[PDB]
Amino acid sequence: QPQELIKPNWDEELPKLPTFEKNFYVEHESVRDRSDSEIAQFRKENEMTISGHDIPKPITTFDEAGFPDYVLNEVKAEGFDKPTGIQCQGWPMALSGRDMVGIAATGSGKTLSYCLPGIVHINAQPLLAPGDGPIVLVLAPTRELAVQIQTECSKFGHSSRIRNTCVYGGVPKSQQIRDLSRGSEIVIATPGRLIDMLEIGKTNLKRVTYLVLDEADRMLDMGFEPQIRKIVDQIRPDRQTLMWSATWPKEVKQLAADYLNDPIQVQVGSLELSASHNITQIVEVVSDFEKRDRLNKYLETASQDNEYKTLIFASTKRMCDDITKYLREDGWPALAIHGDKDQRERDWVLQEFRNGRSPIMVATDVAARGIDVKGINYVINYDMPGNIEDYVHRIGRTGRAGATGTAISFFTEQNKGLGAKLISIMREANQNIPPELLKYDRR
Amino acid sequence: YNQPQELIKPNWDEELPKLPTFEKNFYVEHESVRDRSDSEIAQFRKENEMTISGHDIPKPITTFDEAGFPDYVLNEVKAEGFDKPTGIQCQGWPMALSGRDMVGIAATGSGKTLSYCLPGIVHINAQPLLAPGDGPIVLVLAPTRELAVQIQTECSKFGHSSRIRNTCVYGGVPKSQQIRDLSRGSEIVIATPGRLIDMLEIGKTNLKRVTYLVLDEADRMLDMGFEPQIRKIVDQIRPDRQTLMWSATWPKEVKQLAADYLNDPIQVQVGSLELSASHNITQIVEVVSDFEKRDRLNKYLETASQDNEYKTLIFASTKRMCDDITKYLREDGWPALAIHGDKDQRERDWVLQEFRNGRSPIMVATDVAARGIDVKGINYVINYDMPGNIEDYVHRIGRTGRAGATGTAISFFTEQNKGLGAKLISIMREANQNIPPELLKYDRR
Amino acid sequence: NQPQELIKPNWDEELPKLPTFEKNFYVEHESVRDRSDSEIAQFRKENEMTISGHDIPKPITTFDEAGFPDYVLNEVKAEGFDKPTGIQCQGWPMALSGRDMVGIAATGSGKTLSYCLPGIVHINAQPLLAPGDGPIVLVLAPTRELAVQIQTECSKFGHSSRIRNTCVYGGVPKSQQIRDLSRGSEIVIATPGRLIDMLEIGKTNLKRVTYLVLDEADRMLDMGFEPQIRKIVDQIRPDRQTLMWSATWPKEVKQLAADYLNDPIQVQVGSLELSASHNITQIVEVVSDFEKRDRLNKYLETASQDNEYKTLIFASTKRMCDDITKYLREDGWPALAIHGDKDQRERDWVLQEFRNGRSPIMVATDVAARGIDVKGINYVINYDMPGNIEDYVHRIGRTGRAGATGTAISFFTEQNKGLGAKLISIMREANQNIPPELLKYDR
Amino acid sequence: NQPQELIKPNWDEELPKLPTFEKNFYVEHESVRDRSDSEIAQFRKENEMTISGHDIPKPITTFDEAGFPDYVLNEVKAEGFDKPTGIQCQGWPMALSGRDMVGIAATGSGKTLSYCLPGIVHINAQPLLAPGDGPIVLVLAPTRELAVQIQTECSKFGHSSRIRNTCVYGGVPKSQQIRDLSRGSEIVIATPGRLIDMLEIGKTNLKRVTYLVLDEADRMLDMGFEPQIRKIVDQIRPDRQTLMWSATWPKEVKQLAADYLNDPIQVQVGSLELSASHNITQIVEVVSDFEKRDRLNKYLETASQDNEYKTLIFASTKRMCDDITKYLREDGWPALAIHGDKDQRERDWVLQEFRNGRSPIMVATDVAARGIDVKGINYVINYDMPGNIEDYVHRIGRTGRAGATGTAISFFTEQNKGLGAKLISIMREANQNIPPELLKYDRR
Ligand SMILES: Nc1ncnc2c1ncn2[C@@H]1O[C@H](COP(=O)(O)OP(=O)(O)O)[C@@H](O)[C@H]1O
Ligand SMILES: Nc1ncnc2c1ncn2[C@@H]1O[C@H](COP(=O)(O)OP(=O)(O)O)[C@@H](O)[C@H]1O
Ligand SMILES: Nc1ncnc2c1ncn2[C@@H]1O[C@H](COP(=O)(O)OP(=O)(O)O)[C@@H](O)[C@H]1O
Ligand SMILES: Nc1ncnc2c1ncn2[C@@H]1O[C@H](COP(=O)(O)OP(=O)(O)O)[C@@H](O)[C@H]1O
Ligand SMILES: [Mg+2]
Ligand SMILES: [Mg+2]
């Protein structure tokens, strides 16, 4: 805050900055030749379609990607195989130095599609020369989703000794300045918390050559574009930008044309959320004050069965700090999982929820990602997500074998933008729709 | 928070049947180890000069794939790029992964740290989840702040696959931030005995899940009077745990301690006091230095500054005195860079980059920080502090004068390390020694 | 610094430099004198009274028969109290007469206010406090949880006559405890440990103390408080009025009464016997402090099998009562707590949720659970053990009223050796079986 | 560096390795010799001199008569006083010649400037401080409030030849004591208690101390500081020049001189005694700590009845003098205070408001109320008592010079029993009535 705004004149300062390389792709032995026929059948096998110039070719296995061995032995240490559809096509795009757009399901590997090409980008550049800022900068919509990607970059950047900082709201900055002063090759920042440390000048965006935007759709819902364009005007314009999000409305396409240089977009996601038919959806029009009483009403209704197993969902981590701080004081056993928690800390909470030691657990969307806890009654959406991909995945946590379940959601008028497609999720699963939810179905 | 006290010493003869069950042995003698048979091993022992004395000691490994390590950890030594594991790790791993109490003595250029860190992770993953309010399962004890964090930097690089969390708790610093990391749970704790007891008295940790205890550098740790505090820490750990001792000096106190805390121990020694002792460096250690140390250093740098471009290497034993030495001379107008273990994980390679590029002729470093560097071309290596053994001294001075066949070594010796005066002349008198007018006191019997 | 820490005054020549005060304020009423010598004779015998002294007054029968002014009488009026306790029926006119007295009764019948109401009329008879003068009333309690309740009830009758009271006690920072003494206070309820300290640091003086109270004398002698008390009364004028109060009458309490009281008049009211009703199964486990949470989790899962259990965990202090309920909520258990320092009226919302099965588990202290007939209690768990057995009997006494069945699981440690002799003495009176591990601690 | 430290250094082997300083700078301007040998003899006991030594120099008459440079002499002129004190008339040639010397005089004599000015010329012969070097001049003082009096008194003659001076003393947070020592100072003012606490943390060093002074070594010896200075004087070069100063001549002060001074030379300037010129009604009251606030209030109602009363309260510490000042102000009594740390010139504005009767009550410390003519004051209450009986005689001495009447209310506690023995003989010689309760602390 105390003094800075000035935007630099990059027409004048680009000849003053050092030179960097962005293209690294290796076009490994196997891919060519196949050739140009079985890729087509493989492409739209896993929902791939191309629209761009000089398309690279998809990969099949990890070892066919031009990743070095210090990062390739970490995919092995993490036990994965068969990289995700976007990782099979997005990586040859990213290692070629191209600006690109990537949309896929939230739960797919959009994160590692830019995290791994960012490590090769860093290690090709000289040492950090203290007082130099980061080389990779990724901007995220919310505080605790920045930490999920920051726990995903620490999994593959120890080999290269890469230092990483995460800058986000809601916390004292006196700890993040002492992580930035030690140097950090990757910085994960929220636009609100990042600018006011560039205005006090404890970091620079002068070495940022590889910029990536995770979940740009969510980014637009908080009015953060006045804050991102202000700092993207503080970076060298010849960097490589990588867009990533889950949806494809008209507003992400507007943002792509303003920052990307000849962008290439990857589409893997696809409408046909099936809304597995064995879940009763009850959506209720409520307000800010009306909850915490409907929850007691639906918790004591769940309490009558034994042993019930309830899962409450929130979209922030401090709404889970609020809900849990309220159930426990009313006399309800409650456990929580959010992003600022540690996996092994979150894995003990997941273990105690399966053996039925406490029937209630509050969770966030990022924490409740790829979990199989069978036995779940009464999944409660105390909040509603920003998209219809998380809703189906939120309620998708009920009923595989027994083939029955209920999902209690608390809906309010500031969530109507998804109602129109929400009824079509209830309408395909042949669920009853309340007359007060038809208020959010027109045009 | 605040609480000042507790003391409890438990009666383990009565509390053992109430404790859960755990496994310590895991190692399975992979293909090429068996069998040879006992003809190949015979001189590979003295090829790697390792000395075993116990009963039913397992047989050494040669490959990484020959250790009973899973692939999720074996794919991490690959990402670190290591081949041909260290000699002591080639025999210490079959011993330690087999759940036996052991002591290992070798020079601090070996893999002593990872010879017990890697077997400790499989020990962790064989136990249930941490069940909050449970303390660590592995406890490693270190003498000082900056040795513990090197232990933490080798456990951090190998715990992502298993998501193992590790904390390091050490004295001389406000307690306010390590308590918030202990509460989130940590499977491995690396502690100095000085503060470790100081967190059991106000109670943010327990030693009741500790099944795999390690004592690193027990010789130097014993030299600072930490044993009266180690009595308190081992009296609160299950007596049936697995203890693994490691040190460099092989006294004359371990033999006592090893047989007071280890149950049926197995010792392996790889090092030997007989090698190198490089004669191509003029070693000039004569300065009493009690508190002169800064005054001679400017004068010994004023003589070094005359040549150009000189390249000087200052050595310290602690980080808090290694951030100091740079803090003392830079204010007199001397270009200095600092290198230690606590900070500067990636930063020390930039300082080493500016030491090769000739950007600053002076660099202060500690023994843990100056590990495996070939930055040679270094005149006038100064031991402003002195190490605990005669193998760190030789490696301190050993980084000068190989090709050009000349070098100098200035050390500052004082009564606070007189226990090593006897051993340095044994290398100095082989080294065509100087006159000890001030070591006179420190050679007899 | 806070030095020099004992100085004994010379009362023999500095007492003639201190102001004069009066101790006798009672004026016998029309219906009290006389009846006579038969109605007061029997009335002491139908209330188990036993007097011993010189010039013992006639006991009271109703509130207005006591020589109380009207501004304190209209306080018991608004409090809606019926037919004051026997110890109040005779304890009042003895205290109002300026006489040193001893009152023996069960912990809770009338003892606290037996000296508070006569202590207030003692206060309003003196000039204002002239800031930098200490208190007129000095109350000594052994523990923080007991000293708070004295202040919690002295603050209930000291607002008509504007009156301030303070608690000073160990384990807590003293900075705030001095900023209330900075305001001056007529009454102080003090722990010997923290009282000796603030006198050595010169943040209060005992020069205005003329009316001394020693509550829970049997506790203080069990905790080695006499050598600290002997130093406290070294700084009080010898013509003070000292009032002793206790629950038992061993040889060390009545030696302490003879050493400090001038012509004391004893009154014994209670029954002195602990019958330990036999329809509760008393299970005692000799454990240490690090097993207590594991076995609580295992005894709670045993109660969890019932439908529906209602357990009461017991702690002695506020700090662990906060620990226990902190730890249960993180283990997945529904937990409520009630203690004295906090929870004056919010304490009663907890009792209201615990009676109705809103929450099956409630943690409490011994003082906080005083006089609650919350029937429905199975499995009262003594996570702590008190210093005295009268509280144990009342702790376990909360299990089985009509159905006449219950369980009590106690956690016994080496630190509780002082009560083992009296713990088994009642466990065999109730003819419950004793496990061998606490036979070490008999006699 | 925060271990324990100050193990004795080996000076027979470490002294040849330090740079060198010379101590002799006195020039003995020419006509000081000769007079001679009888007109010096008349000079000696006009000022009550007592000399015992070898090769004794001759004393001074005027400021111009000393072998002082001009940069130091232009300030003795700037204060506007002539004719330095009898102890300054010989103490300067003793100290400026670099010989170990002890001077005894009353506390209030010119004992101070006999060491301040010869210490600065000793500095100016040496190079700049070369940060990380400790001080050259070290003087030891017994009390915080006496240590600040000399460092506020060193701030008068060391500005021109720029010399920085710091005061380090116990009972206060050390975080500001190290940050002025970080500035470096040729003169540092230290209490034995807080000096060892800065040598063990290694934020000052005693390697360059060449000019040691022991001011008021008598009172320092009574507080058990001797085992601590032998700890301190063994951490400094043995070839230094030491300067002792005190008012009393016990057997322990001279055995203290033979143990630390090398070939010491002795001078006294005063025919001792304090005979408590008698004009004050002394009412001693054997009291304890918790009643004194009410006891002073009753003595204030007794003074407040008079008009216009003017009372002076005395304390020994600054911190217990701010307590007294804003403790009766809570009782409704207007009080003003004077101490050594603070109130540089407002010490003088409160003094002007005290005589003209804008405020009748004033609390004071010992050093802050020394050498003031504030007469018109009755009712001086010694709420605290000093460590010796020489300050108290002056403390009560503020009551009655012309009018020939005065009162002195003293508060005595077993915290002051060390002074009870001689308190009675001063009251018995002033033939004041003696309370029965104070006779407890007199003999054996
Ligand atoms: N090929 C793969 N095999 C197994 N797990 C994977 C693979 N790719 C990613 N993951 C896991 O999925 C998660 C990554 O999800 P993320 O990419 O953040 O979702 P989004 O698509 O919203 O970015 C991480 O937990 C990662 O470990
Ligand atoms: N597989 C390996 N091959 C070769 N060197 C290794 C290997 N693993 C670790 N090292 C090196 O050996 C050292 C391991 O630390 P170590 O020397 O055991 O600490 P200490 O010996 O003081 O206990 C480090 O310097 C590290 O670079
Ligand atoms: N006359 C009365 N009528 C009804 N309740 C009373 C009366 N006197 C005291 N009480 C109750 O008894 C308690 C007073 O303290 P008490 O329990 O008597 O301590 P002790 O048991 O040590 O005497 C209060 O909780 C109050 O509600
Ligand atoms: N030559 C002088 N002329 C006038 N005043 C002096 C002279 N020397 C010292 N003083 C005064 O004496 C005080 C110095 O303290 P001092 O009284 O010497 O303490 P001590 O009694 O311990 O010697 C200063 O306040 C100063 O004003
Ligand atoms: Mg080691
Ligand atoms: Mg009571």
Author numbering:
A (entry chain F): 54 to 496
B (entry chain C): 52 to 496
C (entry chain A): 53 to 495
D (entry chain B): 53 to 496
In the authors' words:
Similar to other DEAD-box proteins, DDX5/Dbp2 is composed of two RecA-like domains that include 11 conserved motifs. The helicase core of Dbp2 consists of two RecA-like domains (RecA1: aa 101–319; RecA2: aa 332–465), an NTE (aa 53–100), a CTE (aa 466–496), and a linker (aa 320–331). Here, we report the first X-ray crystal structures of the Dbp2 helicase core alone and in complex with ADP at 3.22 Å and 3.05 Å resolutions, respectively.
The Dbp2 catalytic core bound with ADP (Dbp2-ADP) crystallized in space group P212121 with six molecules (aa 53–496) in the asymmetric unit, arranged in a D3 hexamer. Thus, in presence of ADP, the RecA2 domain moved closer to the RecA1 domain and the helicase core adopted a more compact conformation than in the Dbp2-apo structure. Although the conformation of the helicase core in the crystal structure of Dbp2-ADP was in a semi-closed state, it was in a completely open state in solution. Simultaneously, we observed the interaction of ADP with the Q motif of the RecA1 domain in the Dbp2-ADP structure (blue box). In the crystal structure of Dbp2-ADP, residue Y221 of the RecA1 domain is close to residues G392 and D393 of the RecA2 domain; therefore, the spatial distance is in favor of an interdomain disulfide bridge formation between the RecA1 and RecA2 domains.
